[PDB]
Design a protein around this ligand. Structure first.
Ligand SMILES: NC(=O)c1ccc[n+]([C@@H]2O[C@H](COP(=O)([O-])OP(=O)(O)OC[C@H]3O[C@@H](n4cnc5c(N)ncnc54)[C@H](OP(=O)(O)O)[C@@H]3O)[C@@H](O)[C@H]2O)c1
Ligand SMILES: [Ca+2]
Length: 186
């Protein structure tokens, strides 16, 4: 494909989860940011595709699957068939990428978003393709048992500005956070 997009929220230690869920209680504004960023396509009659690992898919409340208005792709070396609600099942990132390039998908899909977990992010990170990483840095220490892979500061350059991403420190429910965008160019 042309380029990937990755979106994650991280607390101070780069933690992204705890016990199968997020490390922090719900932040409204963070949420809407995710829905908005992942769902919004810049082309009529096109839909965005989201890619995620098995543990992440299941983390989503059942009645809430699949993420409305996007093509849900789950990665798993173990599942035989796509979990109930997913659109496609794939064995590796590569398979996922290939599926996307296929005739039927080729045309129905706008942007591709990697929504985790660790291994998905990592895999996407290493592909020598154009890639933009949308990070929400939550300026607090919540205990996490899952972490964001290490990012290559030589490859991913932090943008100083980007359209429609507030640049100031935000706050909600007594917690502050900041939005950051890194860009990898091949
Ligand atoms: N903060 C955030 O932005 C954010 C975003 C997502 C998730 N989360 C949290 O992270 C946790 C889930 O993440 P996780 O890292 O533990 O799990 P995960 O990546 O969601 O699930 C991992 C599984 O998915 C399959 N998989 C993963 N990478 C794959 C690859 N490259 N090729 C094929 N299959 C692959 C494998 O399943 P098989 O064993 O079946 O092969 C692997 O066991 C939860 O706590 C969730 O709340 C946070
Ligand atoms: Ca397994």
């Amino acid at each position: 494909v042309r380029s990937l997009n990755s979106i994650v929220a991280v607390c101070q230690n780069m933690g992204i989860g705890k016990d199968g869920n997020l490390p922090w209680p719900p932040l409204r504004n963070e949420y809407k940011y995710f829905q908005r960023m992942t769902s919004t396509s810049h082309v009529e009659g096109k839909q965005n595709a989201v890619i995620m690992g098995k543990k992440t898919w299941f983390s989503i409340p059942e009645k809430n699957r699949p993420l409305k208005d996007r093509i849900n792709i789950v990665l798993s070396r173990e599942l035989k068939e796509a979990p109930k609600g997913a659109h496609y099942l794939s064995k590796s990132l590569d398979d996922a990428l290939a599926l996307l390039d296929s005739p039927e998908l080729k045309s129905k899909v706008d942007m591709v978003w990697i929504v985790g977990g660790t291994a998905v992010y990592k895999a996407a990170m290493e592909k020598p393709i154009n890639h933009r990483l949308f990070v929400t840095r939550i300026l607090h220490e919540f205990e996490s048992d899952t972490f964001f892979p290490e990012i290559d500061y030589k490859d991913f350059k932090l943008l100083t500005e980007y359209p429609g991403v507030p640049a100031d420190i935000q706050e909600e429910d007594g917690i502050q956070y900041k939005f950051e965008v890194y860009q990898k160019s091949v």
